[PDB]
Symmetry: D2
Subunit: 252 residues, 4 copies
């Protein structure tokens, strides 16, 4: 029987690339999504056309709230409903936008709920549910950020969320090791730039990258995820692999 994986925010971009590669490797996948229903279903369709009954979609908002625990529990339950098991959890879904300290129409309470909920609290609750539900190679991969110690100006809540995720990666690695669940991270530097970013600003980032003066492809991020879930990483837990082409080594 084939192992099964949950990938959060898997409709597009890096999350899709992770779902696709896990699928090519032989996993059945839960494609979690929030607003991108059309893309999520189009992805599932494609994967099912390749091997029938190997992909399902699963909608959930991962903003922090009193029901987020139930929503995270239901994501994991959806993987067991569809496939009878859940071997791998990839925490990819993430809000990312500035929250200047000194001054959209979002209240600060909402910005906290979204940026901290998606980047940290949902990963934690999903980790709890994943572990509670449990030959085998169980693991969790958290999508981190190589630039958290040299952060972009005015992104303090986003940065707080990614740091917390480093913390979860370490605490969970420690706590879940006795269950054979490994917990690791992958830290992109610049990978796929925001759709709203203009090409000139993209190029400015690209030129900072020592290894090729270009951003990581979605696939290059996915390759590191696939390593960490594989039997080639069976002694690795609590590790965060930078995939940044050297960006984080470059001084101001």
């Amino acid at each position: 029987e084939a192992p099964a994986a949950v990938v959060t925010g898997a409709a597009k971009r890096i999350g899709r690339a992770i779902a696709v590669k896990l699928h090519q490797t032989g996993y059945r996948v839960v494609i979690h999504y929030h607003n991108s229903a059309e893309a999520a279903v189009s992805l599932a369709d494609e994967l099912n056309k390749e091997r029938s009954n190997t992909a399902v979609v699963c909608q959930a908002d991962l903003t922090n709230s009193n029901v987020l625990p139930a929503s995270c529990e239901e994501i994991i339950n959806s993987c067991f409903r569809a496939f009878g098991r859940c071997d791998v959890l990839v925490n990819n879904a993430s809000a990312f936008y500035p929250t200047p300290l000194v001054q959209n129409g979002k209240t600060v309470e909402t910005q906290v709920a979204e940026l901290i909920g998606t980047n940290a609290i949902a990963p934690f609750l999903l980790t709890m549910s994943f572990a509670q539900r449990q030959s085998s190679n169980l693991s969790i991969v958290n999508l981190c950020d190589a630039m958290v110690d040299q952060p972009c100006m005015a992104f303090s809540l986003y940065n707080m969320g990614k740091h917390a995720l480093v913390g979860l990666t370490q605490s969970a690695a420690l706590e879940l090791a006795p269950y054979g669940i490994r917990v690791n991270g992958v830290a992109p530097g610049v990978s796929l730039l925001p759709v709203a970013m203009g090409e000139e600003e993209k190029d400015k980032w690209r030129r900072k990258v020592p290894l090729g003066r270009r951003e990581a492809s979605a696939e290059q991020i996915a390759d590191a995820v696939i390593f960490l879930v594989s039997g080639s990483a069976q002694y690795i837990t609590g590790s965060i692999i930078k995939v940044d082409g050297g960006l984080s080594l470059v001084h101001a």
Copy 2:
């Protein structure tokens, strides 16, 4: 004229020692408290006996909620009301207890308390503090030297303290143009929990290379005092460990 400082969770233990030391250095102080009103007032009485009208108390829950932003604005406002300025913010108040991943507060309440006290309130207080400055201004965050070798079953607490490291660095970067420095002090074993059994306390004391004892609250406060002082005017985004070498000790 005397500068003014806000210390969160200042009624007892390390926050009290920080408040006392700031006051002894010439600061006027806001003593924030949540449940410890009797202690906050007894401290303020003691400080005001030394110098009249140099200590006030301020009550607030720092649990994350819809009203936390307004509570944090008011903490900063209370300093401006009492003393006409706010030069120093010390983020010390903190919830601390285990949140096991695998199995009573509900988990969503644990998130609100642990992530609210250790990260979100410091963020909001940081915003309010800076907004009122939109001179030697600084913020000191009480961090934790053991965040990379955390105690078992303390995920949420650890997440909170890691977020606090992120805020320290992000805010140091962003508030530098205002001359507001942002730094941290990271204790290892200092005052042990009142509820911890005596034998467990000695087990932790025995691990500390430098003296086989915990840090006093005053030794923690000493690093805070350095960081707010004129001797640290080029230091921002720095977290000073005060741990007697504990974090260097392998398993």
Copy 3:
């Protein structure tokens, strides 16, 4: 045509496993050794039995001295003379023993051996490798140590050498990225214990490891080296991958 790799200190234990896996992946190999001639030759013969003319040995002391640069240049030269190319350098060879700060080798010899093997020889080998390089996938992998921030008592020079090696990994990643040469590390926690060590002392260490209460095999260390040199790590440079079973996350 087959790529070629230099592995230092490859006669035994981790280095040998690295050489074997590289060879199994399709690399021709230079097996560098210092004192272990028989084991080095035994390995070369075994690999050449698999595929003729794909393994050579190279003898050299990597202790710091006036001749260390020429020795390192000659190691790299040996790979070019053997195979016409040198795609991968693995800095594995390492002296390891206590050097207490307070009171039969002299301290100047301890400095030379521990700092030479763990840092200076890697640096010199890195210069010589890059100098000879000024669809290729060139890279360097340094064998670091997951425990450098929680070091064993009385191992200061060894620890200093390994920290220096982290600095080299970072500095060389940055400086060699324009040449397409990636530079990374693998940081074991407890892997193969010293051959003399009593089982009872081995067990004290094994029991500290969250993930399975056992040390890493040489092969598990080699797996991470294989990933870093592979096509799946082509955006990874300046990264150190802990392979430690969560050991470094465990407080005193």
Copy 4:
């Protein structure tokens, strides 16, 4: 009786500021120097004018070699000879220059100088200090930019990483003797004499806190704090003094 401190490379710049502050704080000082004989002597004169018999100079090359251990021992011995005690060691002296990986000093000499001054000598000085043994401590001058290093400074950066390692390993090992071991890590402080002014201003402009370099005295302030009674529980810590520079992305 007043405590005594050894400060390496104390004739100029940051080491000088540290020696001056220690002395103002009540220490007798050994002013170590290599080539700067004239500046060393002049500092000792200035300090002894303020308090007589409270400063001496001590000459030593801290390049790695087989006699470096003897030289390091002699620096510590000079403190005991002059003052009968040695309470504080500041490891400040340091070579700093590029050593590109791809092509008048030989590489042998570059390794000796960069690794000797930044790492090996601090190690040997630490050994001799401890062996000859109150508020005893060591402060190592580290570098806030070690994880975002200057291009083509691999040996220098290797030396400074090793120095972090020494700081940690020695804090651990010397704690049973009450000797604390800490670091201070500048970002941009006094720029090289040889650096052009255009390049100096390029670096200044990168510092979030004031768009200026640290003064020597601001670096010395952090050293003074770590040797002080206000840092009695602090060991194995490295205090960045960088105005936020290391937080700034490329």
